[PDB]
Design a protein around this ligand. Structure first.
Ligand code: XYS
Ligand code: XYS
Ligand code: XYS
Ligand code: XYS
Ligand code: XYS
Ligand code: XYP
Ligand code: XYP
Ligand code: XYP
Ligand code: XYP
Ligand code: XYP
Ligand code: XYP
Ligand code: XYP
Ligand code: XYP
Ligand code: XYP
Ligand code: XYP
Ligand code: XYP
Ligand code: XYP
Ligand code: XYP
Ligand code: XYP
Ligand code: XYP
Lengths: 638, 638, 319
């Protein structure tokens, strides 16, 4: 059945093209496997809750915007009952019943790893013609807010410009008592009843209220203004849109924005752990997180039941925690051709869960061909990045590009453009960095007081757990570019490491013993055919490299809106360093997990296509794009 | 069917009382669930291999010695083909076929955690009228061996007397080529063909060659001379007798001795891990051990299929590694009323697997009413001692009594007599030490570089894994006795610990954060109503205790052969301390595992009977025996 | 490491091309993940038992015949100790130790779903210049066997031609006592000591004795004459060659023949069920089979641990 939803409809109707339903949730309450729901032009202010599940990739339930029609799903409501208090501050008042059981003005940003605990923030928000406001703590702060033009990036401790300074003068404050919710805001001269002013009301826009609602496709919608909660790996992880612990969703061709915390969630649900560290306070989030993995294994977490979602061709921006988030629920998923930007720039709250994309246990997840910029952190893979492949992505204008934490691999980072000045946080082992352009520093550190799980290949089955001893990384065919005063760009971080698993084994076994003898020897690194320009430094034992500290590539990423270009100068010597095609055969297995770099189906992986998807021969230029050559280069990269 | 085996029988017979079989293995090849095999007087030189399984506790397959008859199963053969070489050295030669696939003179003591790697030892042995010999490395060492009267105990680094000094002059050496096995030995003047001289030949005496041969009872035999291999938790763990990865055995009323390494094994089998650290050399045994736990979970390791064995009323002695050993295969078992002595005293080889009883993952195992003495280490619980209860045991004349390593509890040590000068090695957390007599030091240490599993209660299901942060121990009603020059007796070890979980939580949560904030606060200890004599020292914050540094109890354990007595003097103030009866209600839950001290069935545990099995009154005196009193005490304890 | 095995070798050698081992099982006892075992021209009368496992599709242990060389692994032995009894019937006698723990002349074709219960058959066999014989039940049946040219196909109940009619006149019968095995056979006029006469001896040709020996490749061999047992789904299922409950084998480019029952087995092992219907007789094989599926699931039967084998480019016949 093909159901239709339109603003001329009725929920008492048949749901046909000629007698359509009025709300998307009515269609969601009757559609069954194989059905399609076509939504016609309009703004639908509701939280859509798919009731029945799709039964296979063939028998999905598809929700889509009608061809050529603009369909918006919003979690907000327009408010036209404001009254002027004094100056530019206005006030509205609503019955608590307006919000039901979830009131964004009462609910706080709260939970494990949230660090800004002194100034409480809430899940509400106020918008003036689409622009969100900044929450203030006290009524008095409403009247003469100060324009701010700079802000401290918490992780890098660097003062950076505020992207939208004017927005810093628009503030809101609310109070909720037993009966009413009262919201105040400074509109800086505008009349909020005349302008288009909205407030957050609902938690999500498209998200099942039961788990296991598999095989849903959601396509072609604009979705916005969701009061989503802080979403650490140790809690339920709702988002503006997400599968809620199920398998096989396809979220595509959507424009998603203004999720308070995370926009798309492919995370976990509450029964396997819900902020126990913050509520019970007896054990740290670290301890409760490794327990949640086993709780989930008992609650069906496996390829058969959870994951294998596809998130493609979406534009996601202006969210406070993440464009995409999730622990466990994203295993075996694919994330590609998305444009992600402006994530967590307002910095109203901070904690260790923020990034354009953050995934915990991203087992065999493929993240490729995405454009990620203007984020405090572009991508964060945290625990169990086993089989994960980050390939052919464009990262720029981020405070940091990529962070791979407490993982053991095998994980692959290939053919990417990592152009920010702080390119990689590496608190893992088992990585392979192949054919990337890396123009920023790498902070590489061991993690000896946290052990985290590893798995059987291509599975959620647990094989063991380990601490991060550091090293056991491969770097081949990368172009590194440093800059004045910037330290730690390149691969010199590994200078004390062994250079082969054979050397490591020989050194450890020189004197009889067990763990202590292994701990005294540094793990191997496999590094060759990299170039180092403008201050980047190589691993001292690399055999074949090109080092020209004096050469300045003058790299620039030029964003022209829908298109993006890369400008780069390369030295004549670039023609003389040639890269090999890497594959499962050429990449040494990781030591602790004892696994190969394979495709998700267990077959050989061959890295013979570049960032522009051009097939390359046996001997080609190093770096992400085969077309790069000595001299001037100007290449369209998006 | 009741099958009979007798030395007047025939394996071509019917196996009845009137027409009995000749070998025990013939009966083992035909007996089925519910049958009994009765073995008549004689020495049976064979390895019995139960073929079919018992099907329930009711439908067991029972192997027993005929009432009032002496039945011996031996892995050796008597050798009467010795020829004098020179002096007191004699030689015999056998075809390699005499040993089949397993030749003790070729097989080495080998594997993970074996520390004596310089001079290789083998699994063979030579006996003169029952007395085993010492292996020597070179042919030349056979001729004038030197009497040794003292030896270094490896762990304690103390020089101690050799129990049987004369035995040190009896030595053997062997060579195996592609055709023959040649064995040389110094008989110090005796004629080995006239005396009764035996050599090890077979690996085991009573042990299935297939796993899953459940519900077998083995009763009333003497078994001896088995060439058993080094048995670490990361390898197959064969023994002289054992269930070989199955459920429900009862091993009772047997006299077992002269197993090269371990005598009774309730350990694991090879498919879940087999000396990978020693063979592959890429990862430590630590890493391969935690992997073997998950390999076994996938290979049916659960209460439904493995464990629940009963080992009772046996006498086990003169073994080189352990009287009882086992990783995983012993879950939910009961070990009681056994007499274990002379374990690993020859010190021909050493490594981290030696103890009278060593069990890894002794989940809900009950070890009680055992007499363990003259061992280098009496009891070693290593990893996953969750629910384990060590109660009413008698430990004396051991270099060390009890070692609980890398465990998280809840584990209970109650009403025991630990009389050795080095009483406890505690490298765990989550313990409860209740009503013991502890006359030696405790070495307590954190373990921050190894994380090990913990489980759901009463189950093999994995709940998580943790490092040992130290503390989270309970000590109530114990009598501690120090000695001149002996440090670390008592509970002062915990002086920097918090005194309740409430205090720990309040201190950790003073400053916001996660794991680092928990790590900076010491775990709680629950200590009260203990006595400290002769130099023992208390936890400074203990509220109610009795400390008399100048009172000397003059403890003595008097072993008269079949009976043992405890001689102890107590001060007048002794009965001023009134101990409480401890139970699930009185014992605070362990922190990391978040579990209670319960009975194996999940119900309340009440510690209301003492070492002599007397019911304890609400208002009892402390220590292991309620009848202890001020003044002189002379009590039969065995 | 690339190990070599050749008839000019020694198991006391290093196992290199210049100093090769003599038996394939010697190489199988030392090869580790990533190694290759190259076997040179010859007939290897042994049961090869891979000891260590391969660790991935990349780090396999590969056993292969040397390029262009004919390598045969057989479970039989040639017998040249035949004595004529009478007419065309000859006899040989072998101490039971010649067979060890598995004697094909004692072992019966037995088990769940076997229907020919009246006349017992055994796992032994006799071959004359490669042609197997037909077992007969009694000593007297050896002397004047009758040529048969048609036979009843049991399922279809149709009488069909016997493909090799002449073979029906070649019969064997054996007796096993406490000390030795006596095998009789009618050679129809040929001298079995002069012709090439073989008898089954070993159960398998290439099969691990432990389960979990993953990622082995076996390529390019001729393998033949294995005394394999009846292999229903409710029993251990050994074959002439097989992975024995593991993952990732590649069995390719081999010529396999004359397995008594099954040649290549990718079946189950004994612990999940072993002819309980036939031995216990309380429940049918149907009931025990559905139970074996759950017993195997508890034992880790899953894509991660079992299966994903490749059997390709082989010629398998006369089983
Ligand atoms: O940190 C942000 C930076 O990455 C860029 O997007 O400009 C705006 C800043 O707030
Ligand atoms: O390279 C970084 C850039 O991408 C942006 O985020 O501003 C801060 C710089 O350090
Ligand atoms: O040896 C190769 C291995 O790398 C795997 O990927 O399968 C293909 C094989 O050819
Ligand atoms: O260490 C041993 C000690 O515990 C006692 O048994 O006497 C003999 C010593 O070897
Ligand atoms: O107390 C110990 C005793 O039990 C024996 O082992 O000899 C050494 C002493 O330290
Ligand atoms: O593989 C995907 C398939 O599962 C889906 O149905 O359509 C899109 C494809 O990319
Ligand atoms: O003046 C402050 C303003 O700068 C910020 O954006 O919102 C908080 C206000 O108090
Ligand atoms: O995940 C499931 C949860 O959604 C349901 O509410 O409770 C049962 C769980 O298995
Ligand atoms: O356990 C995760 C940890 O590795 C990271 O630092 O951020 C906090 C949690 O998301
Ligand atoms: O690089 C991309 C890879 O990462 C993805 O998994 O499959 C498509 C490729 O182009
Ligand atoms: O400034 C934004 C830009 O970064 C994005 O790429 O396109 C949308 C603009 O609002
Ligand atoms: O299970 C029974 C056990 O409880 C008892 O102690 O000994 C006999 C066994 O059959
Ligand atoms: O003391 C003996 C020594 O002389 C011999 O070499 O090795 C065996 C010991 O018992
Ligand atoms: O992993 C075990 C370890 O904890 C102990 O020290 O002995 C070695 C192993 O048996
Ligand atoms: O430890 C316990 C012991 O004290 C009691 O006497 O018998 C049951 C055991 O579990
Ligand atoms: O220690 C004693 C031992 O020496 C003796 O041989 O048998 C009894 C044991 O208690
Ligand atoms: O059942 C017991 C309950 O009554 C008590 O309150 O807590 C301890 C439990 O064992
Ligand atoms: O040899 C190849 C094997 O390794 C792969 O797994 O499947 C394809 C085969 O050709
Ligand atoms: O004569 C019979 C023959 O036809 C058959 O092949 O083997 C059995 C003999 O009895
Ligand atoms: O434990 C079992 C092992 O004994 C058998 O050999 O192979 C299957 C395993 O499940």
């Amino acid at each position: 059945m093909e159901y239709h939803v339109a603003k001329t409809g009725s929920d008492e109707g048949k749901g046909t093209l000629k007698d359509p339903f009025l709300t998307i949730n009515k269609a969601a309450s009757v559609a069954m496997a194989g059905d399609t729901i076509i939504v016609h032009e309009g703004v639908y202010r509701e939280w859509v809750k798919p009731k029945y599940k799709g039964l296979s990739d063939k028998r999905r339930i598809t929700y889509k915007a009608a061809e050529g029609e603009k369909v918006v799903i919003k979690g907000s409501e327009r408010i036209q009952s404001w009254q002027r208090v004094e100056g530019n501050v206005w006030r509205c008042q609503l019955p608590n019943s307006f919000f039901g059981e979830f009131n964004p003005y009462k609910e706080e940003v709260f939970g494990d790893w949230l660090l800004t605990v002194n100034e409480k923030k809430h899940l509400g928000d106020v918008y003036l013609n689409g622009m969100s406001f900044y929450e203030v703590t006290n009524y008095e702060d409403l009247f003469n807010p100060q324009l701010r033009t700079e802000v401290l990036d918490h992780w890098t401790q660097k003062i950076v410009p505020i992207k939208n300074a004017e927005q810093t003068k628009y503030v809101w404050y609310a109070e909720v008592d037993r009966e009413k919710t009262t919201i105040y805001a400074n509109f800086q001269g505008a009349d909020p009843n005349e302008e288009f002013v909205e407030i957050n009301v609902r938690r999500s826009c498209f998200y099942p209220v039961e788990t296991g609602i598999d095989y849903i496709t959601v396509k072609g919608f604009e979705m916005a203004h969701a009061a989503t909660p802080w979403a650490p790996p140790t809690a339920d992880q709702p988002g503006l849109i997400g599968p809620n612990w199920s398998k096989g969703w396809i979220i595509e061709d959507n424009i998603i924005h203004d999720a308070k915390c995370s926009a798309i969630s492919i995370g976990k649900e509450a029964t396997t752990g819900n902020n126990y560290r913050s509520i019970r306070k007896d054990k740290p989030g670290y301890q409760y997180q490794l327990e949640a993995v086993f709780n989930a294994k008992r609650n069906g977490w496996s390829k058969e039941k959870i994951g294998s979602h596809i998130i493609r061709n979406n534009t996601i921006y202006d969210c406070g925690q993440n464009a995409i988030v999730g622990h466990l629920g994203g295993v075996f998923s694919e994330i590609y051709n998305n444009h992600i930007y402006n994530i967590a720039l307002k910095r109203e709250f901070y904690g260790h869960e923020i990034a354009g994309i953050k995934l915990h246990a991203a087992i065999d997840v493929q993240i490729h061909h995405n454009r990620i910029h203007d984020c405090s952190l572009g991508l964060w893979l945290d625990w169990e990045a086993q089989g994960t492949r980050v390939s052919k992505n464009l990262f720029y204008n981020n405070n940091r590009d990529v962070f791979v934490e407490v993982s053991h691999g095998p994980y692959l980072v290939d053919h990417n453009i990592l152009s920010s000045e702080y390119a990689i946080d590496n608190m893992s082992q088992g990585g392979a960095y192949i054919n990337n352009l890396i123009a920023g520093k790498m902070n590489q550190r061991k993690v000896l007081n946290r052990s985290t799980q590893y798995h059987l290949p291509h599975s959620t089955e647990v094989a063991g757990f380990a601490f991060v001893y550091g090293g056991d990384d491969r770097f081949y065919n990368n172009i590194f570019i440093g800059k004045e005063g910037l330290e730690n760009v390149g691969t010199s971080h590994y200078n004390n490491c062994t250079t082969s698993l054979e050397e490591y084994i020989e050194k450890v076994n020189e004197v009889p013993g067990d763990l202590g003898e292994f701990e005294r020897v540094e793990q191997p690194v496999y590094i060759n055919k990299n170039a180092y320009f403008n201050g980047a430094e190589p691993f001292e034992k690399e055999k074949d490299n090109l080092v020209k500290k004096d050469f300045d590539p003058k790299l620039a990423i030029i964003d022209e809106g829908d298109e993006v270009y890369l400008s780069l100068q390369l030295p004549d010597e670039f023609e003389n360093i040639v890269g090999d095609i890497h594959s499962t055969k050429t990449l040494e297995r990781v030591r602790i997990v004892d696994a190969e770099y394979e495709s998700p189906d267990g077959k050989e992986l061959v890295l013979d296509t570049d960032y522009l998807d051009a097939k390359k021969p046996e001997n080609s230029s190093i770096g992400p794009i085969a077309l790069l050559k000595k001299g001037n280069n100007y290449i369209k990269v998006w």
